[PDB]
Design an enzyme around this catalytic site. Sequence first.
Site, short mmCIF file in Angstrom:
data_model
loop_
_atom_site.label_atom_id
_atom_site.label_comp_id
_atom_site.label_asym_id
_atom_site.label_seq_id
_atom_site.Cartn_x
_atom_site.Cartn_y
_atom_site.Cartn_z
N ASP A 107 0.82 -1.27 0.08
CA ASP A 107 0.08 0.03 0.03
C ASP A 107 0.84 1.21 -0.07
O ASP A 107 1.77 1.07 -0.61
CB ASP A 107 -0.93 -0.03 1.27
CG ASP A 107 -2.09 0.76 1.02
OD1 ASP A 107 -2.37 1.97 0.92
OD2 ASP A 107 -3.50 -0.03 0.85
N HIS A 148 -3.56 6.03 3.83
CA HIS A 148 -4.53 4.77 3.35
C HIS A 148 -3.90 3.58 3.97
O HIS A 148 -4.79 2.59 4.22
CB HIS A 148 -4.44 4.93 1.74
CG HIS A 148 -5.26 3.89 1.04
ND1 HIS A 148 -4.88 2.50 1.10
CD2 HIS A 148 -6.73 3.73 0.84
CE1 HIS A 148 -5.95 1.84 0.16
NE2 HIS A 148 -6.95 2.70 0.12
N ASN A 150 -14.12 -0.07 -6.30
CA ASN A 150 -15.27 0.80 -5.84
C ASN A 150 -16.13 1.34 -7.06
O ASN A 150 -16.38 2.58 -6.80
CB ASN A 150 -14.75 1.93 -5.11
CG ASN A 150 -14.00 1.58 -3.84
OD1 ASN A 150 -14.33 0.48 -3.30
ND2 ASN A 150 -13.13 2.35 -3.19
N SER A 159 -11.17 -1.27 -0.23
CA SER A 159 -9.98 -1.21 0.68
C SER A 159 -10.01 -1.27 2.18
O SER A 159 -9.23 -1.89 2.83
CB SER A 159 -9.36 0.39 0.35
OG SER A 159 -8.75 0.47 -0.87
#
Length: 279
Positions: A39, A69, A161, A224
């Site tokens: 990530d 994130h 998404n 996520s």
Amino acid sequence: AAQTNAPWGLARISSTSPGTSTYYYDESAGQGSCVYVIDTGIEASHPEFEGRAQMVKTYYYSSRDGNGHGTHCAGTVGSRTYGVAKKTQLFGVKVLDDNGSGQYSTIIAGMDFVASDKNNRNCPKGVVASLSLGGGYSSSVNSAAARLQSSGVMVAVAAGNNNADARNYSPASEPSVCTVGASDRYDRRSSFSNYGSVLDIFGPGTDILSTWIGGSTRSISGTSMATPHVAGLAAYLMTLGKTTAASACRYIADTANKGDLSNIPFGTVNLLAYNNYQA
Ligand SMILES: [Ca+2]
Ligand SMILES: [Ca+2]
């Protein structure tokens, strides 16, 4: 063990019904497992990680999470207050820049790095990789995720998404990994969650409280956020000896809450991750 006033997603994965607020879990809590969070990085100094997080590789100038994130996802895997597997070891691999973006060649390199690096680490109960990232279909990205799984790592990936069929996104569309959709606290499919035959499982993904950079916390939403719930659950179940990296996704689907979700299109599984904890 029981965590009172837990974030809703933790409570949901330990209950057959929505609307509870206690997270029930075995005290082993993923000890002896390892989870790689691939990530933007992890703020390893955050008190919520208790010294159990470390950065092991970066593809940019620094190993710092300048975005947040990756720290949020890592917190849902394994932070004390916000995590599924509260005693796991966390390893950060920074493949995304501080704007949250990354080229596919770098993402592939980071997956092949984990497949090798896990041989240097002491992870007696097994190894998981959590990939809360994706983009358009790429056979090379799918192949890298398949290699990582083949090497003996439980790979969990976000469905995406786009409120669309996940077959058009990578690594979501690789069949051999564990592709994770998102739900909300009322047991609806999250309005942004991708769907389709390639999804294996749903986890909590709307309004998820976790760690953030600067020693802080915040709530955000996405597939996520669902992915680390499943990655953490896999680590937890591997520590208990109930499954292995090769079969954890199937075991999670077998033992899930079935038929609880609404707004699931025909042809998509209606399965919500569940830890089956009995005191
Ligand atoms: Ca139910
Ligand atoms: Ca799959």
